[PDB]
């Protein structure tokens, strides 16, 4: 409803930040800097102690955030600090399953109320059997959060059905050439925006990705920049050079 609105504009930039890396205040400052820099959707990482599906840069980022005492409670503070700045920009919570599995339905409602619009759970795949349901994806739908799912070329038709069941907002796509047609068949099957999940870090590749994808994600570059010079002005600047046009 808020993600669906933002994709009425075309060719969006998603920016990743690790919640709590540098502390609560810093995370809020960095998010402001990315928004002012033109980022259309914030992907806010719930840091996990064992993020085996993320590249080492993001692993060390998660380590920093947890050593600075990010909790399920200060994450709410962070989201509320962002929403005290901007209440239009969609917020995706990116997370491993366990920190959310250990919370309850009420925490999901508190996330929605704080400002979160979508939840991407990187190690919780949509159920394989056409019958079998997903307690957590059901819980997301029940409170109005958009489950942000990931599909591949080899996605079995059994997923396609159940992935279509729970997917809302937009779908991430992890491709392998004529990839443009490749995205169109996916996009027409789901009637949702399809975003290339690959890590973009320069303007040339972002413009390339947008030929066929409805957006691109800057996963590493922003986090890496906070380790070079953490002054958030350089995050605004980095966004402006990466986003085409």
């Amino acid at each position: 409803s808020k993600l669906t609105q933002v994709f009425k504009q075309t060719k969006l930039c998603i920016g990743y930040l690790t919640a709590g890396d540098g502390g609560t205040s810093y995370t809020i400052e960095a998010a402001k800097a990315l928004i002012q820099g033109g980022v259309d959707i914030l992907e806010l990482g719930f840091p996990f102690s064992d993020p085996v599906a993320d590249n080492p840069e993001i692993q060390v980022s998660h380590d920093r955030a947890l050593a600075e005492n990010l909790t399920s409670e200060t994450l709410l503070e962070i989201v509320e600090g962002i929403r005290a700045f901007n209440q239009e920009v969609p917020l995706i919570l990116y997370s491993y399953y366990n920190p959310l599995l250990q919370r309850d339905l009420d925490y999901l409602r508190r996330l929605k109320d704080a400002g979160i619009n979508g939840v991407c759970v990187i190690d919780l795949p949509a159920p394989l059997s056409h019958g079998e349901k997903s307690p957590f994806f059901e819980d997301l739908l029940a409170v109005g959060l958009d489950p942000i799912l990931l599909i591949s070329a080899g996605t079995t038709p059994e997923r396609m059905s159940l992935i279509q069941e729970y997917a809302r907002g937009f779908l991430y796509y992890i491709p392998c050439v004529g990839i443009k047609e490749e995205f169109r068949k996916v996009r027409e099957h789901f009637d949702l925006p399809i975003v290339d999940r690959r890590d973009i870090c320069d303007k040339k590749e972002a413009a390339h990705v947008l030929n066929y994808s409805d957006g691109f994600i800057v996963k590493t570059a922003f986090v890496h920049q906070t380790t070079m010079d953490s002054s958030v002005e350089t995050l605004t600047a980095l966004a402006q050079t990466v986003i085409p046009g």
């Binding site: 996990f48 590249n55 080492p56 366990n98 599995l101 250990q102 990187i122 795949p125």
Partner: protein
């Protein structure tokens, strides 16, 4: 019990769904293929030294005031621990599925050595990812894996630890799985690895069943095994699980005791959670972040435990307890001095639990402890402790 998921499962990112589905489908055919089962049998006999003996330890029993006590001697397996049962099974599985390469990760190197050993004998390219900090701490096992022909990749990305090697290994498998098998060391992981590892360790209890019937004419009263991830215990338990007269005891690393917070006793203080692709008991804080663990024995020093033990903990079928470092150290010396068998510090946790219950057991009872490995590898660390004599 209130659970959103059955124990186990496959909580995987998209890029691992196809590799895991292929393995599962391939494995269902292979585990009943007689030629594969026969060849694995021949290798375990003529190369690894199965079947391992069952040793009655009368001096040890006397010294701890215990009943009839037997040791299943997985210390006498080639490489000195049960881990080779699973390494040979999975690397033979790789060969049969047409893989030419096997990839693993390792922390202390025990699993890396077993995998590298099986790959050398079977003629497979072997690649072991290891965090650079562990490479520096384990130069003897690194040299051994390299002498065994493995490529040891020193992971200098990220924080240079087990976590970073795991990420590197899984990234490799996602790229190379059409020709690379990923070899998991314990009864952990996404389906189908808990079934695969359990299947290859079940030979332990099949042998025990024959051997204990040969010397005593009946099933044992008690089976005790240590629990790192769960693989030696589940294989040691497996063929006795349906007998309700056989008690099943799993002993975790108790470190400095529960009150100190420095331990690896998932079932003492942990609770279910999703970690490394599966759902099981997990040492984790209120937010679900995985906790740091401690054990004198690095093979037990894990925050996770295999889902088959989680099932038996909640079903009440098996008793999961712990032994502190110092109970394990004392049992180590007691077995060494009384039987001349030098046990691994891992198995010394099983021994320690027997030491503490032995005087209460009626003397006619039959206790089998699974001696999951020999302890020569632990001598430098134990010698550094400078302990005096134990009784």
């Amino acid at each position: 019990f209130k659970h959103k998921h059955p124990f186990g499962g496959a909580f995987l990112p998209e890029e691992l769904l196809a590799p895991i589905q292929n393995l599962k489908a391939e494995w269902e055919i292979l585990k009943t293929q007689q030629s594969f089962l026969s060849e694995l049998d021949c290798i375990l006999k003529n190369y690894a030294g199965r079947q391992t003996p069952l040793t009655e330890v009368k001096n040890f029993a006397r010294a701890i005031d215990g009943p009839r006590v037997f040791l299943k001697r997985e210390d006498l397996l080639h490489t000195g621990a049960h881990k080779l049962n699973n390494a040979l099974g999975q690397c033979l599985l790789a060969k049969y599925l047409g893989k030419t390469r096997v990839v693993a990760e390792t922390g202390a190197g025990q699993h890396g050595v077993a995998t590298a050993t099986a790959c050398a004998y079977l003629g497979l390219d072997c690649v072991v990812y290891m965090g650079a900090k562990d490479v520096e701490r384990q130069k003897p096992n690194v040299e051994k894996m390299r002498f065994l022909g493995a490529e040891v990749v020193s992971v200098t990305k990220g924080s240079c630890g087990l976590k970073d090697a795991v990420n590197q290994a899984l990234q490799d498998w996602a790229t190379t799985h059409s020709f690379t098998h990923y070899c998991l060391g314990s009864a952990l992981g996404p389906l189908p690895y808990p079934d695969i590892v359990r299947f290859f360790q079940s030979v332990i209890s099949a042998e025990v069943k024959e051997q204990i019937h040969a010397v005593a004419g009946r099933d044992p009263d008690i089976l005790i095994a240590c629990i790192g991830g769960g693989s030696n215990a589940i294989g040691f338990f497996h063929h006795f699980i349906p007998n309700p007269k056989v008690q099943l005891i799993g002993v975790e690393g108790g470190g400095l005791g529960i009150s100190s917070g420095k331990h690896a006793a998932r079932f003492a203080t942990g609770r279910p959670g999703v970690f490394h692709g599966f759902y099981s008991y997990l040492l984790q804080d209120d937010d679900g972040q995985v906790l740091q663990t401690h054990s004198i024995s690095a093979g037990l020093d894990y925050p996770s435990v295999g889902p088959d033990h989680a099932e038996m903990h909640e079903s009440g079928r098996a008793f999961y307890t712990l032994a502190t470092d110092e109970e394990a150290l004392r049992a180590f010396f007691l077995l060494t001095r009384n039987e001349g068998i030098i046990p691994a510090l891992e198995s010394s946790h099983a021994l320690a639990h027997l030491v503490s219950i032995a005087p209460s057991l009626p003397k006619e009872q039959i206790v089998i402890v699974n001696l999951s490995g020999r302890g020569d590898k632990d001598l430098p660390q134990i010698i550094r402790r400078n302990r005096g004599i134990y009784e």
